[model samples]
Target: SPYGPEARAELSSRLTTLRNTLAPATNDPRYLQACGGEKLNRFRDIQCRRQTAVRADLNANYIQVGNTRTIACQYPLQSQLESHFRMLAENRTPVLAVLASSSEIANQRFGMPDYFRQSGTYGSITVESKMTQQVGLGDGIMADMYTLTIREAGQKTISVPVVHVGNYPDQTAVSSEVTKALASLVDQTAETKRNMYESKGSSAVADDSKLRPVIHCRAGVGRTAQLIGAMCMNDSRNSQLSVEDMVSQMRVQRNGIMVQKDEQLDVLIKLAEGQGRPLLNS
Candidate 1:
């Protein structure tokens, strides 16, 4: 009775059936095509390879960044929000939050939330002293990014002015924007980081290490990946990871992963190679 064996059995049986049903479709080459146009063909081959299945146990501090990489989780569960926030709050290392807008709540027009507002209950994960930056194209799928800029970097907070220049959503347009945004954001972020260092200004999450800045939509992966890929391209060490590979790595905690289509992955990789620009510059 304490084990709740009945519930466990039912859930396990259901998941197994679900996996079996999905196997056929996942096998379709059209669906699993990687950026190179070659098929993944690894659903079953990589099942036991450790790269396919989700990590059995993940730590909150797991880094997802390349190399000096930390594995992080994008949990959809409300119960986990508090712990995740706590993890970011307490850690000496910086936490770069790539947030997607909450479909359930609406943001006030211009003025930013007073850090304490933290999106009242519509969902979960409320932090007392969080700051926000609105990101994403239109409504329905937008979000705010909170970068642990000050304390971590000791004085540098790059302010990359990310914008929407393409059709709006999808990966290709996003990828293009990332390439341009990267060229712009990186420089601006570096400048902002410098000013913060000299001014010794303090803000929430200031004590954490200088985290890479980011933001996204619906799920943050598409734009997050595009931006991150472009940033990595700027640095040699980061060039090692690709769109498909990175998305594959993130799928452990996130399901129905965002950038599944081949075209999206292609755009991401292209951005990774570093190209494109904003539709206009001021």
Candidate 2:
């Protein structure tokens, strides 16, 4: 059950490949209808579907302040969650990760603690604890938002926010809290980005790599479609890059990409102006 470091690595690698390829529908019962040959295929199909089923709501919100970027993914996973951490780690990009679950599982087949600590090279991941899931949903989801704030010369600081939400989004529920939280993220991201840019320009830090960070949800099609589309419109980059093409690119890693109720590509026009809030009619 608990694969050691070596086996874990191998298994993780295999599972990543398996999940990336053969994108299937999320929780499709077709894969569960049988066993033996059917079961094996179903497992693959489930894996693909789960991977592709990631969805960002059309009403989902985002706010950017410097390196602080925030967006909501309705259903998040340990593998993808950890994938973001690993990507940041590999890039030597310092980050704060919030695990979706409480407490760290040695096996950690899926999900993990809501908050983790980062130091020179390694990070200490804390599993779910008493206050871990203080938010209605879980801190891990909000942990997706982090800031690379600069303090003194050559001294960098991180401002980690509470991942807990007062209210959780669900069926027949309006994600007002989610939208407000996202709005805050956007404000913080913009402020942080501006300060970071100033600090770098002032030689407080050397690297000044302004990034248009990518946001993804399950299926990489609908919700991500709206957020990314809005972002494209807001930045003027969408003019050159078609939203459909962007979804296609995400499919290479996580199949299916997007699933949202409504996608108003016209909103891109407003997002590009950068003068108004991102809305369909606006």
Candidate 3:
């Protein structure tokens, strides 16, 4: 029942055959036609392969995150079934995607939870919630945590930890409590895989074992950037790199307009300091 090497190899082989058939290597008119032609190029333009590309499509973004990844994207309004399946195939399972946006954005239906549910029609990717817990952040902020069971294409089932933070202030620094809470969530999510690797008598964690938890808001620029920045600062073992450099690199790899406000960057810096250094001035 476990989707071990055999399933993975089978899936990989199937994916390769599909890729060869589709031939995404060339920008064929057919591929573009499959994605709704030039009209949908704007939607395609918003994503990148790496944190540092001129224009990384969603597929490119899939490659950039390495293992433990964070992705920023707009709310899925149009059907991107084929691309989503390709993304799932490329990224593999055991991916925890955090929907940082509110349930509804300004009367528009913009949430990944809804998107994923709707996407189930495509390839049988079913999402079911296991449990929900409420965590309090300082200054009246409350985040609801949901343990999600995601079954991909009826071939693999993965545990996805999702936290939805509501009514967050715009363009403001994240509160210390909220920062710590998010940081802790990142650690806990990463620990799940660490434990998995250790169980197999592998003390060293494989790069692919660290699945990147995708984060996104409506625009996938503001609040999403804040969370991604904080996660990078918290997890990076190299103290030599400054938060500025990381943010700069992120903008290049992801998009030029990420980490939208200086206040967000300030919050990440302060969180990284974490009692070691004085707070940075805005």
Candidate 4:
């Protein structure tokens, strides 16, 4: 009806009009469900529901986007920091990619507490930083890296690579230095996922069912979405996927918004094609 009258007035013409008019949700099943065909379920798997709770006991906005390689969730409260770490141990994420630092968490105050320790145990979980690497061009920290030993009871201990993206504040374009760090994060995490699948064949990296790599910041939508999106975009198997597709996938998986700003999306696009670009820049 919108593009009416002799626009062929045929079946082909009607279908074309329908597609154009419904373009927003045409290829997006979750979008259609959200806009109301039938409601999409709260999660892809309900059997694992209780494991995601962290923020306020039942308030973790934990989400997985772009398949098994990526996961997104808000930073957990200090009260739940141990549970968050234990959750990662149980899930077997290859990298603990943190998009913000302790400074940022301190600024946020009531948000997240530093979940790292020199050597300590939290409940049934223990975490220890093994090595340190810094990504910086000046006096300030651009990013920080560490090899973390994550130990949980009754399972093989795992080493998690942690990348703390420092230069990104939030809701805006980050410096090129930060994006470079993100690209490395994307590549390393992808390789980590690959290592998981590779070992699954022979059977250290045997846990194919676990191995979910997660990245997070304050709210899990801004910086969180950008890195997760870049990882999805850089995925070799996802060659046909686009930035918009990854962003849409994230929002659909969470049943909410992600990549909160256009500028942030731009950074995500840059990071996707520019993985390990720091090699050239340095």
Order the numbered candidates by TM-score, best leading: 4, 3, 1, 2
lDDT to native, each model: 0.36, 0.32, 0.49, 0.55
In the range 1-282, model 3's lDDT, one tens digit per residue, is 123345334533543343344333345433222233423333443444332221223422321221235545554434543444444433332334444445454444442445442224345555556545666766877666666555666454555556666656654666756866765675565567546646766423454423445565655656777776666556545344444455544555545455655566556656656634222212
**Ranking of all candidate structures by their lDDT, best first:** 4, 3, 1, 2
Better of 3 and 4 by lDDT: 4
Q: Which stretches of candidate 2 lie above 4 Å from their native place?
A: 1-86, 89-112, 116-168, 172-191, 194-198, 201-225, 240-246, 252-254, 260-282
Kindly give the number of clashing pairs for every candidate. Answer: 22, 39, 13, 0
**lDDT of model 1 at position 233:** 47
Show where candidate 4 strays beyond 4 Å: 1-68, 136-141, 175-177, 189-209, 269-282
Candidate 4 at residue 100, lDDT? 72
Q: Alpha-carbon error at 89 in model 4, in Å?
A: 1.1
Candidate 1, run of 10 with poorest lDDT: 40-49
Q: Write the per-residue lDDT of candidate 4 for residues 1-282, one digit (tens) a residue.
A: 312233213423333343343333334442322234422222222111223322223223455444535556666655555767766666666677777756676685445666753567777778887657766623353667777788877867867777776665544666445555575665675476557647766242554435666677766667777776655655566655544456555554543446665577556545644553210110
Best by lDDT: 4
Superposition TM-score, candidate 4 onto the true structure: 0.65
Mind sharing the TM-score for model 1? 0.43
